[PDB]
Design a protein around this ligand. Structure first.
Ligand SMILES: [Mg+2]
Ligand SMILES: [Zn+2]
Ligand SMILES: [Zn+2]
Ligand SMILES: [Zn+2]
Lengths: 45, 46, 260, 115, 459, 58, 51, 67, 404, 59
């Protein structure tokens, strides 16, 4: 159940790869524009 | 004199004369590419 | 005040590399011979390309420069050909060049690997190494369905100083004094260094004792050829080339002495 | 924009001498051999062969600049000898050494090819 | 906290700071709050058990991604304002029982300390072994390094684009490049560099290159330049049009020849174009009569070749042409090169393979740098990279140069190098290429990932 | 496929919006200027949830 | 006080131990574009004519 | 973007080793043993086959300009 | 021609140079004339102005030429001197254990412009004729100048006791009648210091003589370094296990001492010093303990260096680096200071969230207890970036104030 | 910036503080302790914009 120190180096980088496989490198730019089109514009109107 | 152009979507060799709006008669694409010239260009393998 | 009486002892000879040993000669003669193997050994290689059609993802200069690096069998033909500078012909001829041709088009859906096997030459003696009748064929460029590559190349005679494509060697392992007897090097911790393949010493020892009256002798060599010239032909063509430069230099010298 | 031709390193320019001899005035029986379109390949072998001649007091070579393809060889000999004669014998000795080395290589190649 | 960890009413982006001394409790949902993920920590153990790593390995089958990891309450998005009330653990090793308990009350843990680095700094191998400014100067050079900025470079008609002939992935790479896609679009070449003073042409942040390697495509690149032009029909007073100018009708026609142009007024691909040449023949009607020449000439000192030509219509329905010129840039004297540790310098001179040093075997160094740049800058990473690269090439793997990795030091790399018949400290005996004599000082040599910068001398 | 995106295309020029840093709003910050008639100054850049006017700094 | 000037140049620098401290390596392109207005005299009429 | 012809350092032909190198990797061979079977001993040539990125395979995914 | 580089700080930033035409497209400079311009070859660009008049040509030929601009009135000492390679090799060239054969000498003497063509009698005629480095440098030195200097490693307890005129380490440079009688040359004898062999060459001998003295020192020494050769690698940054154990023990004691100092102040057992606050006293004591450990560790490393070490060959000759760089590369980097003080509590009573609150210890306040070779930890790396970033900010801000 | 994939990613993950490059105060340009995990302490220009133009961290 517990991740041993020898297997940690493989687990941490595995978790990181999942992050970049879902969010990406420019997720902060896409999410910003997305929320702007879905909510901000409709709210401004 | 013919000035045959190429398309970006259909890759059809269509003739286009001057004073003619750019539009592919085969697919209507508005971007045209020119064909490789016939001149003899030399390339030294260095 | 005279020359040496050098000897030779070959320990390995193959179609790719040749390992020999030169004794009773000066370090300069051994080094210059090493430099000639790379920079003063004539060889045939592509030096002129005319792309008639190229729809591949690689521009012309990428292909032309790539064709030059393709080794061509030049064992007995390079000696017969002449340099374009000395030839009294036009831009090209059969005596100063070897015409090549390439015509490939990817009609199928699978990627077509344009290799050196497609380079059709007019002279059957001068052909790509991999095409010489294991080793695979050189990869020039990959083509997609609908792409085409058609050109007309010409090979010439040249040596390394003009371009690396005219280098018939793939590595020249020049070594002398495996055991550091002359102390040309100074190992701060000789025990931490490995033993050379030509070393003659017990594992308990690190380096041979100092020899004050010692001189660089017994130079080892390993001429790994690219494939164009046989490992043995490179040496013979090298010594003949180095002997020709000195012969011509001697002529120009006498031409200056008698003029003074 | 300025890449000099590659063949300019080996080909002699029209009206340019392959070798020029200039007598040195600092010391007697000395000369400077300015050879064009050469490199360390020839300077060292001639240098080494000159040192082995006991009648040669000074024998050295230098490259005024790597980008250039010329070389300067200084030769100082005894009054009874001549530097030009040393530069000639050094070449003749090197030629014989290579001829002997060439022949002895064919024999070794032949002996190895057979067995 | 329990609600945010369960993807409940409170979303993960919500920050909840409980100042204890000051009884304030500030919750934030505004935008712009920079935050990062962290592994939640129980009393003394992590919540990221082994069952998770199992599911994350089969990520392509069971569609178990980062989102399912956050919803499980294992990870938490922590912002800067909340870090003040958070007690982090650099690695799980700090959570174990020690002879003297430092904290013993951890509440969070770092996934990997290397994540504090950006994009241009993650590509640096062993950045924890170099002077900090150097890592900064590299982060500013990585953006100037040549390579393949994008796979579809043949379709994009950009005004300036530098493409490397033979890109290579770094033998000494970090485990973060796999996510930056540097392995797929590298921006440099692994070079056999030798840190030595050879003729003095590499001093004061300079390098000596191998002319033979350059002849085989070493760091060779191509320069793409796009020229755009359009014919404006603003009004009947004066109208522009693409057409082959003529010396009898056009007024502002330079002495340059216009034969390379076609009847359409645009040059054709595959044509060789030099400086002062014309690529677009444009004429404007006058109020050398009734029309003036307004052709677009090429920039001086270019000597390029037209790769392709495009013709289309802009917003105003007018003709719009783009000509992408191609020019091969060979690395020569004056071109700037830089490693991944701030070691920048220009190619002082190009020596051939015959004039360059070599080991017992025919291995000449593609580049030679002056060792004087190491002590002042203290770029030890350049030496370890040159070492791990020599082990990786001789071992058949890719060196893992993660910044903070205790499983890789200089001693282990040295022992692995002694098994392949090389000096454990990377040094190697070289032979002077001019005379063949050995070099008294055993030179340091090995593969090092170098980069070429767009700042050339021809420009 | 590797292009991460996150940028626009205006007149054929790929433009990217640079994230601009700014002092947080609706928060109290007590500073102290050395050269000023006031010893300590507590400001709060206030702005409604749905921003409609500039920041009214008090 | 400070203004642009003719007969100037600019480019990257390079080390060259084979030059004296008072010597500078000038390329052939910059030297070809830049010139020096030399007056003609019977001592240099021959050289300047061939040039 | 495609495997070079010669090694920049030595000059050994490597263009004919990429396809063979890939055919071995898929055969459960190690990067080191594979490079040894191809005759690559010097770490200079091994660098070319182990540090190369076959980008042309990605450039061929885009349709050409002419059919 | 007039060769200039911006920013033009001093009068030597625009010196007259003679033209040398060659193929390639870069401004190639001598390496000694790069110190006045403060110009490195990391992509720097330098303008070139060509005077179009004989008056201007003659004016520059007599006032702004490099030879006439060697010595500066700013500090009555030369500004241009021997440089990176020519300074490290000349050090390893003039040593006592440097012997040249008949072949190597002729190669070096061939690069001498001020050579009468007479080979000097070697310092060893049997059993094998061998020249020494000093015997060749004597030919490089012009005229019959006389100078006395001291090598960087010259001990202070040598000029008092015996062997003051016969140094065992070949220190105490002594030039007599234009001959290097003895001594190891370095920046103190050839650099930009006052009274060096160059400054004396420009005063006694003219400027043209000193010009050749510069070139000859570069060509010859560089052609000899081609044989000896120099490098730098991991073998020079590694120290024996004994040295590391002494360092770790030294640091382990410093961290223990600070813990005692912290316990004293925490128990009110620490009193402030006259003219300083309790907190200032605590920081002063801590800074002293750490600074002493850095110096102690630095000395232990310097002693562990061998005569073949290349790092030592750089600090000794002064070509590049100092004893601090070695101590940071081998033993310990040291304490990182921000605005002359330790890493401040950017967070609430913390430097980083990984440390406890109110932790004035060495690791929490930015003590880099690791070396650049052993590798820095995440916390030590972030702190090291601050000490560096502060340097970039200053270098980027003072330009305006200093330029104004 | 389309000169390399690293520049594109950095430019898309770039920050900017509107303090003004004209400012000569080192306090805002200094690497604060709070740049940990949120920003790259190394990635930053060395010209007249040190510390102002930053670059987001990987995570
Ligand atoms: Mg600079
Ligand atoms: Zn179409
Ligand atoms: Zn012919
Ligand atoms: Zn190789």
């Amino acid at each position: 159940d517990e991740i041993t120190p020898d297997l940690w180096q493989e687990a941490c980088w595995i978790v990181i790869s999942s992050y970049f496989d879902e969010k990406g490198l420019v997720r902060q730019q896409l999410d910003s524009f997305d929320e702007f089109i879905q909510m901000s514009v409709q709210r401004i109107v | 004199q013919p000035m045959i152009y190429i398309c970006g979507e259909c890759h059809t060799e269509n003739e286009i004369k001057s004073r003619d709006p750019i539009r592919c008669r085969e697919c209507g694409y508005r971007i045209m590419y020119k064909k490789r010239t016939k001149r003899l260009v030399v390339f030294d393998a260095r | 005040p005279y020359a040496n009486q050098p000897t030779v002892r070959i320990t390995e000879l193959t179609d790719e590399n040749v390992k020999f040993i030169i004794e009773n000669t000066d370090l300069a003669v051994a080094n210059s011979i090493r430099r000639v193997f790379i920079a003063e050994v004539p060889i045939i290689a592509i030096d002129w390309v005319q792309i008639d059609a190229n729809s591949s993802v690689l521009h012309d200069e990428f292909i032309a420069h790539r064709l030059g690096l393709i080794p061509l069998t030049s064992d007995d033909i390079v000696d017969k050909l002449q340099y374009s500078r000395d030839c009294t012909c036009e831009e090209f001829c059969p005596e100063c060049s070897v015409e090549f041709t390439l015509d490939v088009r990817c009609n199928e859906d699978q990627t077509r690997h344009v290799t050196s096997r497609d380079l059709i030459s007019n002279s059957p003696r001068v052909i790509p190494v991999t095409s010489r009748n294991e080793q695979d064929d050189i990869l020039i460029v990959k083509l997609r369905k609908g792409q085409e590559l058609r050109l007309r190349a010409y090979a010439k005679k040249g040596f390394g100083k003009e371009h690396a494509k005219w280098n018939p060697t793939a590595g020249v392992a020049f070594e002398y004094d495996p055991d550091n007897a002359l102390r040309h090097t100074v190992y701060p911790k000789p025990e931490e260094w490995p033993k050379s393949e030509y070393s003659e010493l017990d594992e308990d020892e690190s380096q041979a004792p100092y020899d004050p009256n010692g001189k660089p002798e017994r130079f080892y060599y390993n001429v790994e050829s690219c494939g164009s010239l046989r490992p043995e032909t490179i040496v013979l063509s090298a010594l003949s080339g180095l002997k020709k430069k000195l012969s011509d230099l001697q002529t120009q010298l006498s031409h200056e002495i008698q003029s003074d | 924009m300025n890449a000099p031709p590659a063949f300019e390193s080996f080909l002699l320019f029209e009206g340019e001498k392959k070798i020029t001899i200039n007598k040195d005035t600092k010391v007697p029986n000395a000369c400077l051999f300015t050879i064009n379109k050469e490199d360390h390949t020839l300077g060292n072998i001639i240098k080494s062969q000159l040192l082995k001649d006991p009648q040669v007091l000074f024998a050295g070579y230098k490259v005024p600049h790597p980008l250039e393809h010329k070389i300067i060889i200084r030769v100082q000999t005894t009054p009874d000898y001549s530097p030009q004669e040393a530069f000639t014998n050094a070449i003749t000795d090197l030629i014989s050494e290579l001829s002997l080395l060439e022949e002895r290589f064919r024999v070794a190649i032949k002996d190895k090819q057979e067995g | 906290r329990k609600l945010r960890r369960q993807m409940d009413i409170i979303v993960s982006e919500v920050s909840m700071i409980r100042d204890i001394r000051e009884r304030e409790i500030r919750i934030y949902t505004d935008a712009g709050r920079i935050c990062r993920p962290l592994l939640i920590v129980e009393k003394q153990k992590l919540l990221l058990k082994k069952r998770h790593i199992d599911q994350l390995k089969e990520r392509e089958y069971n569609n178990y991604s980062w989102q399912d990891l956050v919803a499980s309450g294992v990870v938490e998005y922590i912002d800067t304002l909340e870090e003040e009330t958070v007690m982090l653990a650099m690695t799980p090793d700090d959570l174990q029982e020690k002879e003297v308990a430092y904290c013993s009350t951890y509440t969070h843990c770092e996934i990997h300390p290397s994540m504090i680095l950006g994009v241009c700094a993650s590509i640096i191998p062993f950045p924890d072994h170099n002077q900090s400014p150097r890592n900064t100067y590299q982060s500013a050079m990585g953006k100037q390094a040549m390579g393949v900025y994008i796979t579809n470079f043949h379709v994009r008609m950009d005004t300036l684009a530098h493409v490397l002939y033979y890109p290579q992935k770094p033998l000494v790479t970090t485990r973060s490049m796999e996510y930056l896609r540097f392995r797929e679009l590298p921006a440099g070449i692994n070079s056999i560099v030798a840190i030595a003073s050879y003729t003095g042409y590499n001093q004061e942040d300079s390098v000596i290159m191998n002319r033979s390697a350059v002849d085989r495509g070493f760091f060779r690149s191509v320069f793409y330049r796009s020229y755009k032009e359009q014919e404006s029909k603003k009004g009947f007073d004066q109208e522009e049009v693409f057409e082959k100018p003529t010396r009898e009708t056009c007024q502002g026609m330079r002495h340059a020849i216009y034969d390379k142009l076609d009847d359409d007024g645009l040059i054709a691909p595959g044509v060789r174009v030099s400086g002062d040449d014309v690529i677009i023949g444009k004429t404007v009607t006058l109020p050398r009569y009734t029309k003036r020449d307004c052709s677009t000439f090429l920039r001086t000192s270019e000597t390029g070749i037209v790769d392709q030509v495009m013709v289309t219509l802009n917003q105003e329905g007018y003709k719009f042409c783009k000509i992408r010129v191609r020019s091969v840039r060979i690395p020569q004297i004056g071109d700037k090169f830089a490693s991944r540790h701030g070691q920048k310098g220009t190619c002082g001179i190009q020596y051939r393979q015959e004039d360059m040093p070599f080991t017992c075997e025919g291995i000449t160094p593609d580049i030679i740098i002056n060792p004087h740049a190491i002590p002042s800058r203290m770029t030890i990473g350049h030496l370890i990279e040159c070492l791990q690269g020599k082990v990786s090439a001789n071992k058949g793997e890719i060196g893992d140069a993660t910044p903070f990795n205790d499983a890789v030091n200089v001693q282990k790399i040295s022992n692995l190098l002694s098994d392949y018949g090389y000096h454990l400290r990377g040094n190697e005996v070289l032979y002077n290429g001019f005379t063949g004599r050995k070099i008294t000082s055993q030179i340091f040599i090995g593969p090092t990932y170098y980069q070429r910068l767009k700042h050339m001398v021809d420009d | 496929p590797l292009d991460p995106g996150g940028y626009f295309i205006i007149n054929g020029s790929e433009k990217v919006l640079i994230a601009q840093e700014k002092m947080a709003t609706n928060t109290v910050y007590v500073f102290a200027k050395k050269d000023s008639k006031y010893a300590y100054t507590g400001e709060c850049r206030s702005c409604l949830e749905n921003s409609s006017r500039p920041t009214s700094t008090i | 006080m400070g203004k642009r000037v003719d007969f100037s140049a600019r480019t990257v620098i390079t080390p060259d131990p084979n030059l004296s401290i008072d010597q500078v390596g000038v390329p052939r392109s910059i030297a070809a574009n830049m010139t020096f207005a030399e007056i003609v005299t019977p001592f240099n009429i021959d050289r300047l004519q061939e040039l | 973007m495609i495997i070079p012809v010669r090694c920049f350092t030595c000059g050994k032909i490597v263009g004919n080793k990429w396809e063979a190198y890939l055919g071995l990797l898929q055969a459960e061979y190690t990067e080191g043993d594979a490079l040894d079977a191809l005759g690559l001993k010097r770490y200079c040539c091994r660098r070319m086959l182990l540090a190369h990125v076959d980008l042309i395979e990605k450039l061929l995914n885009y349709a050409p300009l002419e059919k | 021609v007039i060769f200039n580089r911006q920013p033009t700080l001093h009068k030597m930033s625009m010196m007259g140079h003679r033209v040398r035409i060659l193929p390639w497209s870069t401004f190639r400079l001598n390496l000694s004339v790069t110190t006045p311009y403060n110009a490195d070859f990391d992509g720097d660009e330098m303008n070139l102005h060509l005077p179009q008049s004989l008056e201007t040509r003659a004016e520059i030929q007599e006032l702004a030429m490099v030879p006439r601009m060697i010595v500066t009135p700013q500090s009555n000492r030369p500004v241009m001197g021997i440089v990176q390679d020519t300074l490290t090799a000349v050090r390893k060239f003039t040593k006592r254990d440097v012997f040249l054969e008949r072949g190597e000498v002729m190669n070096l003497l061939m690069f001498l412009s001020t050579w009468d063509g007479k080979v000097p009698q070697p310092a060893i005629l049997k059993p094998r004729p061998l020249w020494t480095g000093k015997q060749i440098f004597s030919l490089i030195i012009p005229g019959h100048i006389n100078c006395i200097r001291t090598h960087s490693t010259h001990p202070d307890d040598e000029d008092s006791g015996p062997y003051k005129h016969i140094s065992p380490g070949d220190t105490k440079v002594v030039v007599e009648n234009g001959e290097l009688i003895m001594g190891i040359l370095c920046k103190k004898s050839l650099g930009t210091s006052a009274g060096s062999l160059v400054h004396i060459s420009y005063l006694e001998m003219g400027h043209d003589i000193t010009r050749l003295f510069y070139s000859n020192i570069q060509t010859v020494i560089n052609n000899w370094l081609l044989i000896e050769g120099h490098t730098i690698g991991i073998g020079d940054s590694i120290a024996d296990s004994k040295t590391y154990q002494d360092i770790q023990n030294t640091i382990k004691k410093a961290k223990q001492d600070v813990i005692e100092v912290i316990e004293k102040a925490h128990n009110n057992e620490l009193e402030p010093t006259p003219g300083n606050t309790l907190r200032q006293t605590f920081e002063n004591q801590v800074n002293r303990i750490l600074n002493d450990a850095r110096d102690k560790t630095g000395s232990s490393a310097q002693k562990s260096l061998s005569e073949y070490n290349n790092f030592k060959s750089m600090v000794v000759s002064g070509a590049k680096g100092s004893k601090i760089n070695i101590s940071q590369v081998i033993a310990v980097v040291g304490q990182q200071n921000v605005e002359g003080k330790r890493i401040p509590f950017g967070f609430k009573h913390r430097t980083l969230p990984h440390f406890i609150k109110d932790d004035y210890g060495p690791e929490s306040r930015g003590f880099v207890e690791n070396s650049y070779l052993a590798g820095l930890t995440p916390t030590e790396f972030f702190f090291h970036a601050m000490g560096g970033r502060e340097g970039l900010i200053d270098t980027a801000v003072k330009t305006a104030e200093t330029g104004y | 910036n389309r000169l390399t994939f690293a520049s594109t990613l950095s430019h898309l993950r770039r920050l900017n503080s509107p303090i003004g490059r004209d400012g000569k105060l080192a306090k805002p340009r200094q690497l604060h302790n709070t740049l940990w995990g949120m920003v790259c302490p190394a990635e930053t220009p060395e010209g007249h914009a040190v510390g102002l133009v930053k670059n987001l961290a990987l995570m």
